[PDB]
């Protein structure tokens, strides 16, 4: 037996900046081979409740890894795709070929704690070393907790100081030299007995059927490493336009809706693009745009404002590793028990299917069902319409629906964002400030009404003056323009002005009753 090493892609679906693969590619001179394995256990990579868009994104990314391996190894090496219990597969793989160590990427979320402990107990009882490198995050979340003093940092400014004394996150590592790696061919009988996928399957194989709604996806989303790097060239150009202008974060400085997206959320979550590579490629772009434009009038200042959203994604990761109930309220010591209304399936299905009667909320919710990605402002206005400024429902319903249909469904990030918009856990707690009104925000994100007309196909003849507020359109204009409210486009399911004023009355009462 020559021996073989096992790299498992629970996440971090890439080859560049993979410390797990660097440990996998080590011990070459002894004769230890390499086995790349993906396991479809129904839980890994967010497959418990997965829509057609995210399942295609995972399936397209697996083809890109297989195409990368078949190009560097000229067909000698290929990805192995399985479907079964991970403890059963690794035990049978250890019997055929003697393993040496299983190297993974560290998934810090506690929903993978039961899976990791089962694997950790398996290798310890089989005299197999366990390797768990961390590359999904800039800093180790358990390291931040230990340096803070046994309690996670409960403030963004307190978390920013905690990572200041930790140091800068590490630079991206080298690229794996898979051109000389040893791959082992298995017995074909062992492949059918272990449910090995001889070809890459379809999303219909996992009972995830493509809906008829996805015809109106104006843009197309493609996963994998190759699409992650080509889009990275496009977003850094967007950054360079803002860097020569004097401001940062162009996605939240100039909010553009009716164009191609410039977000590294889907590729970064699945690991098609390394976060550390994304962190440093936009900081080194900021470093040499400060130096060579210092002769010009505009001079930069430096700091962490360039990647201010990446610290936010680590803030939710830090206060979720030790909280197994991070996605709910019962047993959760971070969020209050806000008395939401009784869960109404009629209002929820109207909100989920994009039939609420508000053109921005209808346009945004139909975009998620068709493409799987929204803008951050578009995600905030549909999370405020359901929890605070509107239906007054529980955020757990919106969190579960977001986790099923998002292209970037991160368990710690989405639950943290849903508990911020509802304002139940973090700072600016129980705020009685102005809520995100969809009527006013639609009139200036897309004043022309192009984006609303794109995703709502019932408003072709509706002009730009009436498309944001079709309820102001008269009955005579409704007949001649094919915008009959109630039979073509739904009426507003709730009164927005009455519901907003009612909720802040209950919001102020909770704040007053919080004291004593």
């Amino acid at each position: 037996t020559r021996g073989a090493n096992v790299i498992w892609f629970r996440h971090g679906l890439r080859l560049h900046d993979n410390p797990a693969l660097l440990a996998a590619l080590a011990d070459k001179d002894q004769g230890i081979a390499l086995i790349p394995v993906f396991i479809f256990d129904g839980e890994s990579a967010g497959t418990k409740n997965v829509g057609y868009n995210r399942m295609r994104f995972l399936l397209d990314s697996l083809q890109d890894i297989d195409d990368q391996l078949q190009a560097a190894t000229d067909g000698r090496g290929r990805l192995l795709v399985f479907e079964g219990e991970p403890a059963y597969i690794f035990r049978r793989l250890h019997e055929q070929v003697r393993l040496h160590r299983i190297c993974i990427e560290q998934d810090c979320e506690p929903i993978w704690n039961e899976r990791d402990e089962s694997i950790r107990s398996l290798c310890r009882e089989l005299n197999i070393d366990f390797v768990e490198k961390v590359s999904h995050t800039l800093w180790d979340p358990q390291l931040v907790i230990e340096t803070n003093g046994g309690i996670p940092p409960l403030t963004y400014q307190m978390f920013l100081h905690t990572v200041q004394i930790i140091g800068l996150p590490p630079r991206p590592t080298a690229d794996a030299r898979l051109e000389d790696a040893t791959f082992v061919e298995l017995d074909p009988e062992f492949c059918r007995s272990l449910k090995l996928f001889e070809q890459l399957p379809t999303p219909e194989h996992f009972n995830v059927y493509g809906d008829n709604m996805g015809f109106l996806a104006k843009i197309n989303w493609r996963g994998g490493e190759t699409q992650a790097l080509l889009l990275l060239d496009e977003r850094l150009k967007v950054e360079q336009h803002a860097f020569e202008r004097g401001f940062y974060l162009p996605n939240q400085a100039l909010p553009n809706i009716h164009d191609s997206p410039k977000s590294m959320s889907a590729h970064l979550r699945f690991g098609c693009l390394s976060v550390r590579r994304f962190y440093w490629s936009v900081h080194d772009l900021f470093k040499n745009v400060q130096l060579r434009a210092c002769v010009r009038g505009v001079q930069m200042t430096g700091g962490a404002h360039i990647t201010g959203q990446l610290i936010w994604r680590e803030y939710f990761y830090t206060m979720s590793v030790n909280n197994p109930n991070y996605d709910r309220m019962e047993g959760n010591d971070i969020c209050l028990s806000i008395p939401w209304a009784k869960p109404n399936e009629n209002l929820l299905q109207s909100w989920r299917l994009g039939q609420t009667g508000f053109p921005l909320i209808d346009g945004a919710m139909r975009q998620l069902l068709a493409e799987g990605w929204l803008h951050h402002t578009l995600r905030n206005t549909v999370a405020t319409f359901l929890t605070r400024g509107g239906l007054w429902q529980s955020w757990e319903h919106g969190l579960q629906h977001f986790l099923k249909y998002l292209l970037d469904a991160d368990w710690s990030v989405c639950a943290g964002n849903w508990m911020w918009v509802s304002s139940s856990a973090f700072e600016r707690l129980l705020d009685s400030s102005l809520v995100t009104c969809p009527v006013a925000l639609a009139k200036r994100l897309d004043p022309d009404g192009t984006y609303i007309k794109q995703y709502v196909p019932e408003l072709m003849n509706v002009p730009k003056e009436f498309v944001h507020e079709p309820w102001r359109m008269s009955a005579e204009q409704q007949e001649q323009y094919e915008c009959l409210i109630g039979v073509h486009y739904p009426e507003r399911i709730i009164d927005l002005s009455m519901a907003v004023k009612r909720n802040m009355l209950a919001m102020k009462s909770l704040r007053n009753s919080l004291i004593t």
Binding site: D333, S337, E427, L429, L441
Partner: protein, 759 residues
């Protein structure tokens, strides 16, 4: 950065502030609620982080929402709220938590850059003429809405003035943080020109003139003078002079910025038929120019156009707004409350505009209340007290320095401009004999005065060449020559040298004036034929007119004495008896109640072989009873002749110490000699070391009927000075004993709330 998760809320609120339907802008009905929520969030935010203000800066919501909302508002309440929010928004960073101490760290300079970018972008938003048009229209609507102004309306007017001042104060970010190149001059030099041009197209000059003409000017005089100081920034006095020659609730914004913070940069360096014709030319060319520039509201705004505009403003400003502004500022500075008015603005006002009033031979009936003894008396009081504060805070580090240097440089020029205007009006003989008699009597009161006369000994002896500039020495010696000339024309004729020059210019000639006078010859070409002409005349009174010749040869300036001897700048005969006649004197060199322990102190003074140190100060402790006797009397006697000691009046109504400052060295170092201090600590008087300075204190409240018996034992009883009449009050010190007992110097959370709720 961390408002990123709160960005869509602010975006929605600012989008809902104002919605556009077709061509008519319509405001939201709940715009007042949205604006008051925004103002409450901005005022009650974190002091150090300033996260909400940086959020407004990052979102660029100002030019997108607030400027159109200010432009197209109609109701007064929404306009007032928008004005208040804008005023709270465009506060200069220097008025915000003293940015220089926390600028050092990277997060600190990032915050400074973010706030400065917000200020610059708000100024770029305000460069549009419609925003200033809306503000000027709001001004006019408040002003002629009703003849009587409510205090709330006065506060709104005040807010508008603060908005204008803040907008004009923003370019300090543009001045140095931008650091323009040749590709940034055509926009950078024209941003302020466009701001001023749009201000004057909407006739802000008439608004300001009516504002100072309004009787309610006390509500906004401080912001009025601050905006006047901020109107001129890069327009020097040279081009103005050439044009005048060519003529013929923890946090807030109002107080969280009004802590002085005076704009720096120095913001400075028949004939009557002709005045009549030039007044008609003023109004005619002003109206023709105004219709021309409203024809050219978009044009090339240049610096000479700005200079002409400021000329047409300042010519009528000196005519009508001068006295009405400065007398209100003087009355507000005389108020007993803790005033927030920056004194350097008032000093700048008198220096910068008195030369404009004097050069144009402006007729007196606007300027009588300004060219007066009271403002000069207050000027010398503030000079004494400001040098007091400077030498108090010089020992202990950690205080401001450059504001103190600029305040010195402004109070010294203020003495220069008054007496220069007095001399220029003496030169002019067009004025009648009544104002001639007024000028002669004011010159008499300046003659018999004693406080500004050795104020120059004060700033020539406590001067440090390492703490000031070369122009300060030039300015000071110009004031020396000017006051000496006032003493030579105003006192020899008008008073018959009552200060007894040979005794009193021995308070000059102390050789601490000789060294810094000698630095003037080191820069002798910088003075030209103006200030070089000043100094040998002072030298001539010392060398030729006083009996001191062998002493005026100091080794540091003996070589510079040879520098004139090798230059030989064709000097006249008034001082060729100095450069040529005295060089031969070194070319051929000779190389209970009554007498007590106090009596043992007063004869010790005689053991110093002289008693001139007593009468030098003793007159002041004779005078300590008088001023609060007159305040007790409440009547008027022939004032001016009865000088009342300008260093004493403007602190005794403020009831503080009335210090005897050091003046001249043979009497100054006596305030370290125990013989003088012995009577200054026997009965109990605050030592200067307790006050931190080296000016000896004279405190107050000792019941001025008591301030003559202890004063009688002090020195002789030379009553040649009949500057007092206390026939009733010469009775209650010894004949009313034990009114004060024998007392001397004797001392006498979010996770937290979550937990709370869930539990």
């Amino acid at each position: 950065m961390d408002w990123l998760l709160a960005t869509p809320q602010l975006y929605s609120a600012f989008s809902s502030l104002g919605c556009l339907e077709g061509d008519t802008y319509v405001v939201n009905p709940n715009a007042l609620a949205i604006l008051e929520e925004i103002n409450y969030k901005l005022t009650y935010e974190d002091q150090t982080l300033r996260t909400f203000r940086r959020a407004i800066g990052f979102g660029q919501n100002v030019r997108s929402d607030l400027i159109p909302l200010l432009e197209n508002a109609k109701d007064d309440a929404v306009l007032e709220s928008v004005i208040r929010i804008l005023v709270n928004l465009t506060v200069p960073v220097e008025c915000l938590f003293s940015v220089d101490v926390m600028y050092r760290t990277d997060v600190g300079r990032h915050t400074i850059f973010e706030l400065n970018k917000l200020l610059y972008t708000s100024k770029e938003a305000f460069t549009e003429a419609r925003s200033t048009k809306s503000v000027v229209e709001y001004m006019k609507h408040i002003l002629e809405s009703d003849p009587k102004l409510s205090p709330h309306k006065c506060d709104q007017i005040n807010n508008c003035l603060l908005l204008l001042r803040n907008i004009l104060h923003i370019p300090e970010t543009h001045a140095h943080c931008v650091m323009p190149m040749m590709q940034s001059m055509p926009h950078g030099i024209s941003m302020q020109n466009t701001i001023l041009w749009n201000l004057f197209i909407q006739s802000i000059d008439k608004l300001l003139l009516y504002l100072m003409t309004c009787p309610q000017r006390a509500f906004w005089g401080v912001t009025m003078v601050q905006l006047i100081a901020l109107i001129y920034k890069d327009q020097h006095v040279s081009t103005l002079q050439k044009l005048l020659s060519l003529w013929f609730s923890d946090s807030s914004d109002n107080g969280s910025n009004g802590r002085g913070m005076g704009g720096g940069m120095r913001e400075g360096t028949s004939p009557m038929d002709k005045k009549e014709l030039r007044r008609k030319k003023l109004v005619k060319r002003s109206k023709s120019s105004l219709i021309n520039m409203k024809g050219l509201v978009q044009h090339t705004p240049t610096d000479d156009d700005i200079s002409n505009l400021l000329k047409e403003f300042t010519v009528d400003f000196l005519l009508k707004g001068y006295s009405y502004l400065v007398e209100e500022l003087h009355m507000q500075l005389l108020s007993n409350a803790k005033v927030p008015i920056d004194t350097s603005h008032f000093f700048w006002l008198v220096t910068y505009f008195l030369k404009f009033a004097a050069q144009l031979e402006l007729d007196m009936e606007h300027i009588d209340t300004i060219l007066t003894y009271d403002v000069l008396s207050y000027l010398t009081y503030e000079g004494v007290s400001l040098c007091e504060q400077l030498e108090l805070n010089a020992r202990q580090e950690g205080s401001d320095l450059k504001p103190y240097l600029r305040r010195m440089h402004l109070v010294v020029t203020a003495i220069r401009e008054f007496l220069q205007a007095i001399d220029t009006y003496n030169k002019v003989t067009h004025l009648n004999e009544d104002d001639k008699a007024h000028l002669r009597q004011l010159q008499l009161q300046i003659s018999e005065m004693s406080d500004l006369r050795c104020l120059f000994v004060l700033l020539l002896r406590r001067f440090n060449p390492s703490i000031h500039s070369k122009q300060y020495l030039q300015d000071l010696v110009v004031t020396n020559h000017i006051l000496l000339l006032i003493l030579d024309s105003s006192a020899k004729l008008g008073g018959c040298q009552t200060i007894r020059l040979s005794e009193h210019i021995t308070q000059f000639a102390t050789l601490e004036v000789m060294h810094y006078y000698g630095i003037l010859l080191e820069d002798f070409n910088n003075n030209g034929e103006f200030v070089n002409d000043c100094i040998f005349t002072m030298m001539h009174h010392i060398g030729g007119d006083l009996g001191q010749i062998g002493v005026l040869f100091q080794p540091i300036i003996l070589k510079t004495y040879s520098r004139i001897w090798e230059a030989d700048y064709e000097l006249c005969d008034d001082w060729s008896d100095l450069i040529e006649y005295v060089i031969h004197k070194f070319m051929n060199t000779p190389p209970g109640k009554p007498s007590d322990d106090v009596q043992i102190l007063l004869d010790l003074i005689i053991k110093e072989n002289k008693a001139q140190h007593l009468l030098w100060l003793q007159r002041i402790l004779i005078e300590c009873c008088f001023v609060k006797l007159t305040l007790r009397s409440g009547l008027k006697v022939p004032e001016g002749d009865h000088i009342m000691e300008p260093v004493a009046y403007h602190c005794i109504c403020k009831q503080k110490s009335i210090p005897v400052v050091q003046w001249n060295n043979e009497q100054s170092t006596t305030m370290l000699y125990q013989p003088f201090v012995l009577l200054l600590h026997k009965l109990g008087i605050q030592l200067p070391a307790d006050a931190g300075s080296i000016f000896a204190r004279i405190p107050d409240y000792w019941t001025p009927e008591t301030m003559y018996g202890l004063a009688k034992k002090l020195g002789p009883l030379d009553k040649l000075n009949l500057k007092f009449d206390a026939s009733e009050l010469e009775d209650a010190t010894a004949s009313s004993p034990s009114r004060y007992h024998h007392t001397g110097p004797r001392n006498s959370n979010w996770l937290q709330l979550v937990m709370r709720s869930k539990c």
